[PDB]
Scaffold this active site. Structure first.
Site, PDB file in Angstrom:
ATOM      1  N   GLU C 204      66.191  17.884  27.776  1.00  0.00           N
ATOM      2  CA  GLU C 204      65.305  17.229  28.736  1.00  0.00           C
ATOM      3  C   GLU C 204      64.120  18.131  29.089  1.00  0.00           C
ATOM      4  O   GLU C 204      63.845  18.420  30.253  1.00  0.00           O
ATOM      5  CB  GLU C 204      66.076  16.816  29.994  1.00  0.00           C
ATOM      6  CG  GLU C 204      66.981  15.610  29.812  1.00  0.00           C
ATOM      7  CD  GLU C 204      66.217  14.308  29.709  1.00  0.00           C
ATOM      8  OE1 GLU C 204      65.044  14.265  30.134  1.00  0.00           O
ATOM      9  OE2 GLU C 204      66.793  13.319  29.210  1.00  0.00           O
ATOM     10  N   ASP C 205      63.415  18.567  28.049  1.00  0.00           N
ATOM     11  CA  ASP C 205      62.209  19.379  28.170  1.00  0.00           C
ATOM     12  C   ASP C 205      62.476  20.752  28.766  1.00  0.00           C
ATOM     13  O   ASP C 205      61.619  21.302  29.458  1.00  0.00           O
ATOM     14  CB  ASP C 205      61.137  18.660  28.997  1.00  0.00           C
ATOM     15  CG  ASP C 205      60.694  17.359  28.367  1.00  0.00           C
ATOM     16  OD1 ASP C 205      60.564  17.315  27.127  1.00  0.00           O
ATOM     17  OD2 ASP C 205      60.476  16.379  29.110  1.00  0.00           O
ATOM     18  N   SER C 206      63.643  21.323  28.517  1.00  0.00           N
ATOM     19  CA  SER C 206      63.946  22.687  28.917  1.00  0.00           C
ATOM     20  C   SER C 206      63.849  23.611  27.708  1.00  0.00           C
ATOM     21  O   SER C 206      63.780  23.168  26.560  1.00  0.00           O
ATOM     22  CB  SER C 206      65.336  22.766  29.544  1.00  0.00           C
ATOM     23  OG  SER C 206      65.642  24.092  29.918  1.00  0.00           O
TER      24      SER C 206
END
Ligand SMILES: [Mg+2]
Ligand SMILES: [Zn+2]
Ligand SMILES: [Zn+2]
Ligand SMILES: [Zn+2]
Lengths: 257, 48, 477, 44, 115, 64, 98, 35, 49, 192, 40, 240
Positions: C204-206
């Protein structure tokens, strides 16, 4: 049910790197050895800096950061050196640390390169590896950098500056007989330097009964330890980790009963 | 609705005020359901 | 047109528009008209010739400059109103070359189509391979990256300043970046980025960062906070001065330690400070003298970098104190590439834990493969592939948007010459177990940016704090 | 209490009461001298 | 502000046990070994050595959290073999293998250096 | 601002190669040839010198 | 004397005008600094360009809500005099009226 | 004589480079204030 | 008032070469704050005499 | 936890190799786009020669735009399906789409085959200039290139005109997102 | 054809207004005109 | 004037009654943590060491709360205050002398937030019930809030800079309210569409698709590794 009988074949041994092959070993043992190379082999690095004067263009903990990353010769002194936490002195002493001093003043129109050659230790055994030299900071006329630092024992698990390796190449099954990696197109993949396949061949035939063995290493040293010393220290360090665990396990088993 | 050959049952409007003044409050209740359902289900979403 | 191109009576910025259908000629000389230089085309040929290029090549020691191109009538400025009457060729090599006669009346040519982009969009590499909103997002992120904002930053005392320890110029760059001085003052580092799902901490966009690389100064930065305080003598009764308060002299003093303060009321440079410390000791005489010293925020913890004392415009003695705080990358800090791929650091793994190639290379940053498919930032994949060829070839890669000489196939063929998979995939080994990962991981150098948004600047908690007296409700203290 | 002039970089001892100004330069921007106290940095 | 000291990953704080054994009541002859301040370096090597034992029915390890520094090793053995006995024999075999590797690497260094 | 001591990716020493790298470039070496002459084989280390910006040089143009 | 004009840095009336890069460094100024802003009480202030409709041009628009079918406006301004702009409308009344 | 396609890419960026050697990037702000 | 009549947030055709098509703040200011293209020039004005 | 630890063995990535297609697949896409352009040209010729009969409920302009849009819409679908069929079982774009984790069929086709028609307010790119979308086209140019049809993929890259029209189409999404944020919870707080 | 949808249409319903943005009807035919295009 | 004080969006009736700042709340950036349960939130030590929960002193916990008072603010987990039966507050860090710090039944010890504490976790805008769910606190050693990847969907949260609010219920009655009404597992299925609100997401969804393919075969060692992460596993290795 018992231990492997691993064998070692050293392929190349220079002052910078050691290339060797370990055979008749488990993948876990081979991998744990390369993790110890990076994270658990103790060397000596600067972990304490007092800056008495810093007129340079780099702030104080910029300079300290660069000092900590300078490799120091710690081949034989490291073994007999103690950890500051383990040592009973008043936070620092010759038995657990090495003092360093740097006192550079620029009084010339030419830019003064403060290198590791300017780092002076009270222990002849522990000196900067380069003594081209590592640049610490460049000084303009009228700028000075005066500091004293202590180098203590540590390993790469605490900070990357205590990592003695400049790259650990690790490999096994270069021809992919085990099919531990599945190539969508095996023809597109270059052959490993350890590959033993013909030019036409792209993959070794699948070996359903095969196991990961014959692991290839190339341990490159930063300079603190000799590349052979890293491997020997890693094997003794990993062995000490297990012997310590066994000692603690024995007491726990006794307490349970 | 009064026009000849025009279904006086299924014929409806998307104007709630027009429905209210022609059919009644209960017709509005049903019409409002259908208008509210149509917008919600336009993109395929579902609400209980 | 002839007079303007000769610069005889009509200046370059004068726009003449003829509306043939409406039988009107509109000449505009006022200010505020936006125009751009366009190459003049006559008889399906550029007036710009090799002789003009040769003179420009010796720009210095020749006195030949851009103005001679305008004076020579080879290039002219066209405003939007005049552009409606202009038949414009995108390129000379393709548009006005002999071919199927789509148009044989070109009047102007573009110098380069990539000049449509602005300053921030001109650093995006391969922006024509990205979805357009992602180019817009990067233009926003590029203005929040860290680097060296200005060379003389030590002399300056700004309220907030972020300086990266080791800015790097991109391995893959655009031709326009030469004029933005982005090479001279870069904002970011070239990161060995692997696009893989390693342990679920990049979801999740980490981002998963290499702890060993961070230990070596990877994306380390400085944070400078400057505090200004002035002492005002307005009011005969009250006269505030700089001095460290003393218990006997001042009726009321906080239990905060004033040992840091000097006899002039100002903390000296090179002193650790925290929330409990006082940086400026200012005492106001009562109509004993009350103290009005300045305290730091609990969050801040740095070292006093500089203390300057002056008289402001008003002529009052005032001091600017710059506090230095080193910010090491940690979990929660935002990082971004030049393609709108923004994300926080989910976890940091030491070099032994990170997955490694056969050469022992471990990625500095690991990003989730699920960030690409929706965003369609293919330019990020091409930049990594080009950057891999650049680092191996020793040449800075060219990511100018509308370049036909560069394509993925050409970049891929180059990558094969260096003993790498032509598509940039590599066989990675598990750091935890050492076993080969079944899938081959896309890994290569990508230019990443550290954004001003740090988690320390954002983390804050409240638990029975200093309510307001009037409202009896919470407030900051 | 030493202040360094921003123009000529002259170190001059300045009292709290007396005006802040370079003794010989006349410059009006003064920088405090670095503290004599010792601060420890871990090279991490 | 919340950054932990780098040494917390390998140094036991006061009152912390390096290894603790807990019986696994789900299955007979099963024990859970919670080893503090250890990572995949010892978990993987120990677990793989256990699997070489034919009397070990199950052997696995895990790091419950990367930010924490414990490894849990679960060992299930045959009724006539103790999980603790399997663990001790696993470590002795690893120490035996590592000691043998040290000797043979030392011999190889002499061979290469000699000529 | 100044050349990092270690390569970020692998920890190889790079801080004693910037001056040599600049000297090699002055000797008409191509950037790739200079890196090979300096022993930088891994592209992670080549990245260190190929993408370095030496701002410390211009920072020294301001008098202390 | 009638006042003081704030000066845009690195402009013809700025002290850093024509100074060579070495001269700028002597003044603790970044040569790469582009200028183009004002220092107002020590704060570097940039004037953002304001987009507005061109003057002296006849524009014919149509408004559905309003009572005019079409409106031809013209914002007239002098040649650098009387900054205030006077707008004249010539609107054709809508045909809606019955 | 004429700029051939094989030389166009070099040529066009020499023209662009000369433009920014003369104007820069904030020429609009400075020119406006000078006027 | 003028902005109300026609929406200026949209990227108009005529911005080509004059205003960057990509750079615009996200949020309430989408399309209202713009940036010059690199070779874009704004005329300073001159007398038509 | 169970599958996050098996993925450590299996691994999952995405790269340039997943964005490529076969030379045969590229040829098929090129043929479809080449034919689709010719089909739009024929529709233009019919309209120019007054041989286009308006359909019920639509004017001649709406009829032409409907006919052109369906031709280009069909071309995008035909090329999009072709690109998807070329994908192998190993392709990582497909694996994320098949599992539903991220992406869709349209994302794959745009990356591999064709970005497609750019629309502003539901219509092709408007003649913002005088009878032109950009100064690089002839007046009254209703062809796919003029009116905002991107014939390239993201892998191949967009031409300067396609890049600008795609930016015009992408600005519409940016504006809508801002409006939704403003409208977020407005109805909810009125109902509550 | 086009009618209001989404939030603006949802807004109209909760904001019941004498004049919707796109008022319309849906007339159904009950005679032969329903199945006969010409009669419809 | 008095009318002005009440009027406006910031007036007393609207700006100070319908909505207001609250004590015992925290906010920071959120980062992923696949090692947490869906009903579990990772909390920085600083946030936990700053927010407290008042525990009523009982013979059940008299000794346990006595230790926390001794540890005090200096050592975490400790306590910040002591509330006697009189209702008066004693600041521990000022004076740790155990003589003045003896506890007895009815005293309330405001101990630091510890593992297993119930908190309300919220992402704004709060659009539906699943935007404020209850979590069990898990202290972790860095400065971010951690979230299981599944609960990101109900929160509409991403790990690209999002920040989420943490509210700590301060009494047993309100703590039981969150446990029995607002915990994440009780929110799995939403009444809005009578379907689950959170599901399997990017890596786990992509991998479970691969994992379940017909030609995925696991060796003995691999299976024993996956079984270490199956908390509900009964301990019996299935027949291959
Ligand atoms: Mg977000
Ligand atoms: Zn000692
Ligand atoms: Zn002076
Ligand atoms: Zn390297």
């Amino acid at each position: 049910p018992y231990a492997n009988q691993p064998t070692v074949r050293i392929t190349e041994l220079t002052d910078e790197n050691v290339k060797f092959i370990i055979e008749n070993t488990d993948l876990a043992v081979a991998n744990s050895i390369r993790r110890v190379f990076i994270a658990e082999v103790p060397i000596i690095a600067i972990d304490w800096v007092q800056i008495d004067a810093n007129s340079s263009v780099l702030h104080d903990e910029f300079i300290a950061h660069r000092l900590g990353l300078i490799p120091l010769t710690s081949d034989d002194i490291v073994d007999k050196l103690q950890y500051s936490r383990d040592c009973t002195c008043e936070e620092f002493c010759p038995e657990c640390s090495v003092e360093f001093t740097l006192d550079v003043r620029c009084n010339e129109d030419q830019t003064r390169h403060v290198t590791s050659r300017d780092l002076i230790s009270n222990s002849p055994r522990v000196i900067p590896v380069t003594s081209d030299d590592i640049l610490i900071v460049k000084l303009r006329k009228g700028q000075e950098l005066r500091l004293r630092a202590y180098a203590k024992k540590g390993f790469g698990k605490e900070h990357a500056k205590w990592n003695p390796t400049a790259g650990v190449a690790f490999e096994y099954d270069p021809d992919n007989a085990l099919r531990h990696t599945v190539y969508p197109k095996p023809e597109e993949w270059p052959k490993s330097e350890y590959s033993e396949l013909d030019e036409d061949e792209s993959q070794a035939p699948y070996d359903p009964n095969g196991k990961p063995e014959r692991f290839y290493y190339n341990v490159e040293s930063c300079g603190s330890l000799r590349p052979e010393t890293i491997v020997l220290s890693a094997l003794s360090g990993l062995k000490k980790k297990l012997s310590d665990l066994q000692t603690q396990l024995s007491h726990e088993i006794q307490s349970d009963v | 609705l009064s026009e000849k050959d025009v279904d006086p049952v299924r014929t409806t409007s998307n104007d709630i005020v027009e429905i209210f003044t022609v059919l009644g409050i209960e017709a509005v209740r049903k019409a409002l359901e259908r208008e509210l359902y149509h917008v919600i289900s336009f993109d395929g979403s579902y609400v209980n | 047109r002839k007079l303007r191109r000769q610069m005889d009576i009509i200046v370059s910025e004068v726009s003449m528009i003829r509306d043939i259908r409406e039988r009107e000629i509109r000449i505009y000389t006022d200010a505020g008209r936006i125009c751009r230089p366009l190459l003049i085309v006559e008889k399906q040929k550029l007036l710009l010739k090799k002789r003009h290029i040769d003179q420009l090549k010796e720009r210095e020691y020749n006195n030949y400059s851009w103005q001679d191109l305008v004076a020579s009538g080879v290039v002219e400025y066209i405003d939007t109103l005049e552009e409606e009457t202009v038949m414009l060729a995108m390129t000379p090599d393709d548009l006005q070359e002999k071919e199927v006669a789509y148009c044989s009346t070109y009047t102007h040519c573009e110098i380069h189509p990539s000049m449509i982009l602005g300053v921030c969009a001109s650093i995006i590499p391969f922006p024509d391979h990205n979805q357009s909103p992602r180019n817009t997002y990067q233009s926003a992120m590029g203005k929040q990256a860290m680097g060296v904002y200005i060379t003389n930053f030590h002399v300056r005392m700004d309220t907030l300043a972020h300086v990266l320890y080791y800015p790097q110029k991109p391995l893959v760059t655009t031709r326009s970046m030469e004029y933005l001085r982005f090479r001279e003052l870069p904002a970011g580092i070239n990161s060995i980025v692997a696009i893989a799902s390693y342990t679920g901490y990049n979801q999740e966009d980490s981002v998963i960062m290499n702890r060993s690389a961070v230990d070596r100064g990877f994306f380390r930065s400085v944070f400078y906070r400057s505090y200004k305080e002035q002492e005002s003598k307005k009011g005969f009764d009250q006269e505030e001065v700089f001095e460290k308060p003393t218990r006997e002299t001042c009726q009321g003093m906080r239990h905060a330690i004033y040992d840091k303060l000097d006899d002039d009321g100002l903390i000296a440079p090179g002193v650790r400070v925290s929330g409990d410390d006082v940086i400026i000791g200012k005492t106001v005489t009562l109509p004993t003298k009350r103290d009005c010293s300045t305290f730091l925020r609990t969050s801040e913890t740095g070292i006093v970098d500089q203390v300057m004392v002056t008289l402001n415009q008003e002529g009052y003695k005032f001091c600017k104190i710059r506090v230095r705080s080193v910010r090491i990358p940690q979990i929660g800090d935002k990082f971004a590439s030049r393609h709108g791929q923004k994300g926080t650091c989910g976890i940091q793994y030491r070099q032994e834990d990170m997955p490694f190639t056969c050469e022992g290379i471990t990625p500095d940053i690991i990003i989730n493969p699920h960030a690409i498919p929706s965003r369609m930032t293919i330019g990020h994949l091409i930049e990594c592939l080009q950057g891999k060829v650049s680092a191996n070839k020793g040449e800075i890669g060219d990511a100018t948007p509308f370049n036909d000489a560069v394509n993925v196939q050409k970049i891929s063929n180059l990558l094969s010459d260096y003993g790498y998979h032509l598509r940039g995939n590599e066989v990675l080994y598990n750091g935890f177990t050492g076993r080969k990962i079944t899938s081959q991981i896309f890994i290569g150098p990508t230019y990443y940016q550290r954004l001003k948004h740090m988690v320390d600047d954002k983390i804050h908690s409240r638990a029975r704090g200093p309510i307001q007296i009037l409202n009896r409700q919470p407030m900051e203290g | 209490m030493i202040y360094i002039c921003g123009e000529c970089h002259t170190e001059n001892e300045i009292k709290s009461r007396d005006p802040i100004r370079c003794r010989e330069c006349g410059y009006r921007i003064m920088y405090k001298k670095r503290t004599k106290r010792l601060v420890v940095f871990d090279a991490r | 502000m919340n950054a932990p000291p780098a040494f917390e990953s390998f140094l036991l704080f006061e009152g912390e046990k390096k290894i603790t054994i807990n019986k696994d009541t789900k299955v007979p002859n099963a024990c859970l070994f919670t080893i503090n301040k250890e990572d995949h370096t010892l978990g993987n090597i120990i677990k793989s050595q256990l699997l070489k034992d034919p009397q070990v029915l199950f052997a696995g390890y895990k790091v419950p959290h990367p930010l924490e520094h414990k490894i849990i090793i679960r060992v299930q053995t045959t009724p006539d073999y103790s999980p603790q006995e399997a663990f001790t024999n696993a470590i002795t075999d690893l120490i035996s293998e590592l000691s043998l590797l040290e000797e043979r690497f030392r011999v190889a260094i002499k061979d290469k250096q000699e000529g | 601002m100044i050349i990092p001591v270690r390569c970020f990716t692998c920890g190889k020493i790079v801080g004693n190669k910037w001056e040599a790298y600049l000297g090699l470039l002055q000797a008409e070496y191509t950037e790739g040839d200079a890196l090979d002459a300096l022993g930088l084989k891994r592209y992670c280390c080549r990245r260190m010198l190929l993408a370095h910006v030496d701002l410390i040089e211009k920072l020294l143009n301001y008098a202390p | 004397f009638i006042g003081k004009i704030p000066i845009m840095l690195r402009s013809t009336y700025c002290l850093l005008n024509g100074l060579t890069d070495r001269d700028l460094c002597e003044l603790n100024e970044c040569p790469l600094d582009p200028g183009g802003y004002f220092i107002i009480n020590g704060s570097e202030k940039v004037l953002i360009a304001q987009e507005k409709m061109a003057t002296n041009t006849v524009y014919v628009f149509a408004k559905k809500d309003s009572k005019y079918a079409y409106t031809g406006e013209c914002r007239s301004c002098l040649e650098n005099s009387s900054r205030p702009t006077s707008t004249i409308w010539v609107s054709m009344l809508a045909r809606g009226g019955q | 004589d004429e700029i051939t396609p094989d030389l166009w890419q070099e040529a066009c960026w020499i023209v662009i480079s000369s433009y920014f050697d003369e104007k820069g990037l904030v020429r609009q702000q400075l020119d406006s204030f000078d006027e | 008032r003028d902005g109300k009549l026609a929406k200026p947030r949209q990227l108009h055709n005529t911005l080509w070469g004059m205003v960057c098509p990509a750079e615009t703040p996200e949020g309430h200011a989408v399309g209202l704050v713009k940036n010059l293209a690199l070779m874009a020039y704004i005329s300073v004005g001159s007398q038509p005499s | 936890t169970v599958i996050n630890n098996w993925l450590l063995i299996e691994g999952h990535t995405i790269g340039i190799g997943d964005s490529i297609a076969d030379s045969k697949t590229y040829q098929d896409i090129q043929n479809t786009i080449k034919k689709a352009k010719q089909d739009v040209i024929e529709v233009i010729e019919k309209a120019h020669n007054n041989e286009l009969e308006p359909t019920p409920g639509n004017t001649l302009r709406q009829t032409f735009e409907n006919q052109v849009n369906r031709i280009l819409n069909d071309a995008r679908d035909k090329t999009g399906s072709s690109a998807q069929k070329s994908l192998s079982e190993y392709n990582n774009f497909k694996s994320m789409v098949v599992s539903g984790a991220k992406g869709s069929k349209i994302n794959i086709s745009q990356v591999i085959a064709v970005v497609g028609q750019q629309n502003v307010e539901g219509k092709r790119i408007p003649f913002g200039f005088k009878h032109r979308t950009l100064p690089h086209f002839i007046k009254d140019d209703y062809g796919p290139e003029s009116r905002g049809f991107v014939e390239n993929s993201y892998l191949a890259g967009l031409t300067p005109t396609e890049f600008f029209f795609h930016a015009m189409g992408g600005r519409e999404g940016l504006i809508d997102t801002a409006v939704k944020t403003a409208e977020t919870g407005y109805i909810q707080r009125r109902l509550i | 054809k086009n009618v209001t949808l989404g939030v603006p249409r949802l807004k109209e319903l909760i904001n019941i207004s004498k004049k919707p943005k796109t008022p319309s009807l849906t007339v159904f035919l009950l005679g032969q005109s329903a199945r006969d295009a010409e009669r419809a | 004037s008095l009318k002005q004080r009440l009027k406006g969006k910031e007036g007393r009736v609207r700006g100070n009654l319908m909505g207001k700042r609250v004590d015992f709340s925290a906010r920071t950036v959120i980062t992923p943590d696949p090692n947490l349960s869906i009903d579990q939130v990772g909390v920085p030590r600083s946030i936990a060491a700053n927010m407290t929960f008042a525990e009523i002193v009982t013979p059940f916990n008299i000794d346990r709360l006595q230790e926390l008072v001794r540890r005090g603010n200096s050592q975490y987990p400790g306590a910040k205050y002591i509330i006697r039966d009189n209702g008066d507050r004693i600041d521990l860090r000022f004076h740790p002398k155990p003589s003045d710090l003896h506890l007895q039944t009815g005293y309330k010890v405001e101990r630091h937030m510890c593992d297993g504490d119930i908190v309300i976790f919220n992402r704004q805008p709060t659009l539906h019930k699943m935007s404020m769910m209850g979590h069990r606190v898990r202290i972790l050693p860095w400065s971010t809030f951690r979230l299981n990847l599944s609960v990101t969907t109900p929160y509409n949260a991403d790990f690209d800079g999002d920040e989420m609010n943490l509210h700590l219920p301060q009494s047993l009655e309100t703590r039981a309210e969150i446990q029995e009404l607002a915990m994440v597992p009780r929110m799995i299925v939403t009444p809005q569409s009578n379907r689950p609100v959170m599901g399997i997401v990017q890596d786990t969804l992509t991998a479970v698709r691969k994992f379940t393919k017909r030609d995925v075969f696991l060796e003995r060692g691999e299976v024993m590794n996956l079984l270490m992460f199956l908390s509900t596993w009964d301990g019996k290795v299935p027949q291959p």
